[PDB]
């Protein structure tokens, strides 16, 4: 139960979801860009983008705006799960190629 890792930014959040900013600590362009790409591949998402507000802080604000179908939190969850599935695909292909050679 990590209550400090990901935070919904309430000031940058719309009524009834569909728009939100999430602050993620100890993360940088590595996760930000991959997560943004995966989320942008969601047909309901109309706005995905992250920013590292300052280099001196291990911090990352990712912005999600959707249409009315789902919420920004659900879009983020789907994006994270799809990133995991992508990583599984890559791992399986690399492992089978290493074994075969």
């Amino acid at each position: 139960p990590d209550r400090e890792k990901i935070k919904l930014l309430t000031q940058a959040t719309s009524e009834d979801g569909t728009s939100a900013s999430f602050q993620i600590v100890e993360e940088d362009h590595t996760l930000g860009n991959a997560l943004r790409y995966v989320i942008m591949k969601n047909p309901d998402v109309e706005f995905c983008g992250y920013s590292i507000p300052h280099p001196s802080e291990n911090l990352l604000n990712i912005r999600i705006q959707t249409y009315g179908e789902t919420t920004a939190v659900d879009a983020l969850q789907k994006g994270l799960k799809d990133l995991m599935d992508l990583c599984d695909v890559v791992e399986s292909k690399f492992t089978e190629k290493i074994k075969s050679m």
Binding site: T95, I98, K99, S100, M101
Partner: peptide, 17 residues
């Protein structure tokens, strides 16, 4: 080469300190 070490060796160092 061409032999998996991730399968046989448990990755301890990858745990978050």
């Amino acid at each position: 080469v061409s032999r998996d070490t991730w399968n046989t060796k448990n990755m301890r160092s990858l745990e978050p300190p």
